[PDB]
Structure formats: C-alpha cells, structure tokens
Amino acid sequence: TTYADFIASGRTGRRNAI
Amino acid sequence: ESVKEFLAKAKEDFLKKWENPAQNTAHLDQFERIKTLGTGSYGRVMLVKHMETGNHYAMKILDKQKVVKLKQIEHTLNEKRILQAVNFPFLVKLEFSFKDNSNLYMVLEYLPGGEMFSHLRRIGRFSEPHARFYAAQIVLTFEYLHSLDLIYRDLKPENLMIDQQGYIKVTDFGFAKRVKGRTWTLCGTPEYLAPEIILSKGYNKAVDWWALGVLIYEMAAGYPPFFADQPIQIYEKIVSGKVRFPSHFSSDLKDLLRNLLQVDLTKRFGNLKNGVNDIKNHKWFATTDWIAIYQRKVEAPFIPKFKGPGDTSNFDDYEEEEIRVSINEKCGKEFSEF
Structure with a gap:
C-alpha cells in the first residue's frame, strides 16, 4: 500500500528546509 | 466589515510597522x-x-x-x-x-x-471536514499575507501550531519575503516545492497555492502526494506531471487538488483573474462559513489535551x-x- 511505502521511508519525521 | 475594508485597514497597519x-x-x-x-x-x-x-x-x-x-x-x-x-x-x-x-x-x-505534524503522524490522517477546517485557515492566512505582497514559502504541518481552541497558527517566517515582482531563491521543503521552483524559474505567490495543495493532500491522505527516500527522487515525481489520489478522496477534493497541484500557472487556482475566490467558491468548501472561521466561531474538530x-x-x-x-x-x- 502507499501508506506502507511511506511508513517504511526515511522521510516520516520532521522535514528540514532546503 | 467587508473583506476589502478589512484588507485596506490591514495594509495601512502593516505599512506603518514595515517602515518603522x-x-x-x-x-x-x-x-x-x-x-x-x-x-x-x-x-x-x-x-x-x-x-x-x-x-x-x-x-x-x-x-x-x-x-x-x-x-x-x-x-x-x-x-x-x-x-x-x-x-x-x-x-x-x-x-x-x-x-x-x-x-x-x-x-x-x-x-x-x-505542531500539526506530530498529531497528523500519530493519528495517521484527518477526515475531509477536519482537513477542510485547517485548510480554510490557511486560505484566509494566504489571502492576508499575499495582500501585503508577502510570499510565505514554507507551508507544511511542521510550521502549523495548534492552539488551545484547536485553531492553527502559522510559525517560521525564515523564507517569508516582501516582493511585488517575481523572485528566484531556491528555498522551501522538498515535498512542498512547486515545479517552477525546482526548475529554477522566476516565481511568485502561486508557489504558496501549490504548497496548499500538498498540505491538503497530506492532511487527508496521511502521506504527501510526492514522496521518496531522497529529495532528488521527490523532485523527479513533482516535475513528472502525475499525481495519484487515495480511493477514499471525494470527487470534490480530487477536483480542488488537480486545480492547486497544477503545473500550468495560467490554470493554477489562487493565481487567476478571480484570485482566492476560485478556492473559496470551490464545491469542496461549500459548507465553509469563511467569516465564522475568521471570527473563530466554528467548533474545532480536535483540541489537544491541555x-x-x-x-x-x-x-x-x-x-x-x-x-x-x-x-x-x-x-x-x-x-x-x-
């Protein structure tokens, strides 16, 4: 599922500005 | 008072402070x-x-x-x-x-x-009325900021604080800028960047409207429309011109999102001749009382434990x-x- 893919990704925490 | 009366007084108050x-x-x-x-x-x-x-x-x-x-x-x-x-x-x-x-x-x-961020991640996602309540606050906030020639440039759940009444407050103006023309600085957060920023073009307040589309999608889905393990992979997805919506998204939500997550600047809602009214008058916001939201009279869908x-x-x-x-x-x- 897209949810499972998001949760397994390295970008679920607070995101930094570029 | 009317929106115009309010905004005229708002500009006069802002300019006095901006100048001194x-x-x-x-x-x-x-x-x-x-x-x-x-x-x-x-x-x-x-x-x-x-x-x-x-x-x-x-x-x-x-x-x-x-x-x-x-x-x-x-x-x-x-x-x-x-x-x-x-x-x-x-x-x-x-x-x-x-x-x-x-x-x-x-x-x-x-x-x-x-931050809305922590509550959104823990709960998983917000139902459409819940996401709409927050989205209405952002629409009004951008109507205010944009009227003062300000571009915000960092909309995301991490920058949205939840008050004791369940209303939101935008924080972190690290990339906010007063600009009447176009601007070029590469800044913002990867998931929220408009294609024109990624492609190093001169851009304007329409980038904030694109970021609103990303925020509504993330609030309602529980994950952003364009995600990957690295920023380079996120940019490829943003510029590809393709977006997929969860099957639980309403027809009205998908229609609004296609109009905000719109690559064509002559078609993106918020940018056009009718401006913010294209967003306020959209079917997805038909139940939204814009004045009641501004006056903080609408009951919040969620109050954090105090x-x-x-x-x-x-x-x-x-x-x-x-x-x-x-x-x-x-x-x-x-x-x-x-």
Missing part, C-alpha cells in the same frame, strides 16, 4: 530557560518563562555566525521585519526581539498543543546546549537593523 520596525524590545536576562523545543541548521527554539509576567514563550535563537555561513542574512532580516509588522489570528505573534554579541532572538507565543502553559509533552527531547555570548560583537554591520 520595532527593535531591541527585551533582553535575555528577562527570561528563564526551560527546555529546548527544537534544533537544526536554521537555529534553536527554546521554551522560556518571562519573569515579569509568568508567561511562557518559544524563543527562537540564531547564531549570527551560522546565519552568515548559511547565506541567510537577508532572509533573517526579512523574517524579523515581517513578523513585527503582521497581525492575523492564524499567525504566531512575535512578542519581543533583540540581539546580543553572538545571537539573534525572536520571542514568540508558545502553543503547548505543538496539560499546562509550560507543558512540553508535544515536543521531542533535544540535546541541551549552552547559550554562549561572546565578549566581542560579531557581525555588527550585517545585523545592525535587527
């Missing part, structure tokens, strides 16, 4: 350090207690030398100059600002409810570092107007 900014309105010795609420390359945020009042505040601490290395001098002067000049129910208020030999300080109202004005349970733990103040003034000229 408030400076050096407090000192570090008027605050007691409580806990570090956040830390990154852009600086730290510290929970402090103001002794004279007993009020709690979120103190943003910037190291002048680090700001210089990060090429953020003009952006920091923008942030403070804009914050001291604005006044809107859904913006975090700048209570005081000052600087010393080593650091710049911006003392903001503290919302123990924390545990005291200095409670920090909605924030993570961070390494506690010293607030070093050199005996020598650093970057005197660069930050003279702060």
Whole structure:
C-alpha cells in the first residue's frame, strides 16, 4: 500500500528546509 | 466589515510597522530557560518563562555566525521585519526581539498543543471536514499575507501550531519575503516545492497555492502526494506531471487538488483573474462559513489535551546546549537593523 511505502521511508519525521 | 475594508485597514497597519520596525524590545536576562523545543541548521527554539509576567514563550535563537555561513542574512532580516509588522489570528505573534554579541532572538507565543505534524503522524490522517477546517485557515492566512505582497514559502504541518481552541497558527517566517515582482531563491521543503521552483524559474505567490495543495493532500491522505527516500527522487515525481489520489478522496477534493497541484500557472487556482475566490467558491468548501472561521466561531474538530502553559509533552527531547555570548560583537554591520 502507499501508506506502507511511506511508513517504511526515511522521510516520516520532521522535514528540514532546503 | 467587508473583506476589502478589512484588507485596506490591514495594509495601512502593516505599512506603518514595515517602515518603522520595532527593535531591541527585551533582553535575555528577562527570561528563564526551560527546555529546548527544537534544533537544526536554521537555529534553536527554546521554551522560556518571562519573569515579569509568568508567561511562557518559544524563543527562537540564531547564531549570527551560522546565519552568515548559511547565506541567510537577508532572509533573517526579512523574517524579523515581517513578523513585527503582521497581525492575523492564524499567525504566531512575535512578542519581543533583540540581539546580543553572538545571537539573534525572536520571542514568540508558545502553543503547548505543538505542531500539526506530530498529531497528523500519530493519528495517521484527518477526515475531509477536519482537513477542510485547517485548510480554510490557511486560505484566509494566504489571502492576508499575499495582500501585503508577502510570499510565505514554507507551508507544511511542521510550521502549523495548534492552539488551545484547536485553531492553527502559522510559525517560521525564515523564507517569508516582501516582493511585488517575481523572485528566484531556491528555498522551501522538498515535498512542498512547486515545479517552477525546482526548475529554477522566476516565481511568485502561486508557489504558496501549490504548497496548499500538498498540505491538503497530506492532511487527508496521511502521506504527501510526492514522496521518496531522497529529495532528488521527490523532485523527479513533482516535475513528472502525475499525481495519484487515495480511493477514499471525494470527487470534490480530487477536483480542488488537480486545480492547486497544477503545473500550468495560467490554470493554477489562487493565481487567476478571480484570485482566492476560485478556492473559496470551490464545491469542496461549500459548507465553509469563511467569516465564522475568521471570527473563530466554528467548533474545532480536535483540541489537544491541555496539560499546562509550560507543558512540553508535544515536543521531542533535544540535546541541551549552552547559550554562549561572546565578549566581542560579531557581525555588527550585517545585523545592525535587527
């Protein structure tokens, strides 16, 4: 599922500005 | 009063402050350090207690030398100059600002409810009425900011604080800028960047409307429309011209999102001849009473558990570092107007 893919990704925490 | 009457008075109030900014309105010795609420390359945020009042505040601490290395001098002067000049129910208020030999300080109202980010991740997703309630606040906030020629440039759940009434307040004006023409700075957060920013074009306030599309999608889905493990992979997805919606998204939600997450600037909602009304009058917002939202009369779908004005349970733990103040003034000229 897209949810499972998001949760397994390295970008679920607070995101930094570029 | 009407929207126009309100906005005309809002511009007059903003310009007076924009032209003669408030400076050096407090000192570090008027605050007691409580806990570090956040830390990154852009600086730290510290929970402090103001002794004279007993009020709690979120103190943003910037190291002048680090700001210089990060090429953020003009952006920091923008942030403070804009914050001291604005006044809107859904913006975090700048209570005081000052600087010393080593650091710049911006003392903001503290919302123990924390960031929408933490609640969104834990709960998983917000139902359409819940996401709509927050989205309505952002639409009104951008209508206000854009009327003052301000572009925000960092909309995301991490920058949306939840108050004791369940209403939101936009925080972090690190990339906010007063610009009448187009601008070119590559800034923002990967997941929220409009294609025109990625493609190094001159861009305008339409980037904020694109970011609204990303926010609504993330609130309602529980994950962003374009995600990957690395920023380069995110950019490829954004520019590809393709978006997939969860099957639970309503027909009206998908239609609004196609109009906000629109690559063609001659078609993107918020940008067009009718402006913000293209968004306000969309079928997805048919039940939204724009005035009742502004007047804070709508019952919030969620109120964070209140545990005291200095409670920090909605924030993570961070390494506690010293607030070093050199005996020598650093970057005197660069930050003279702060």
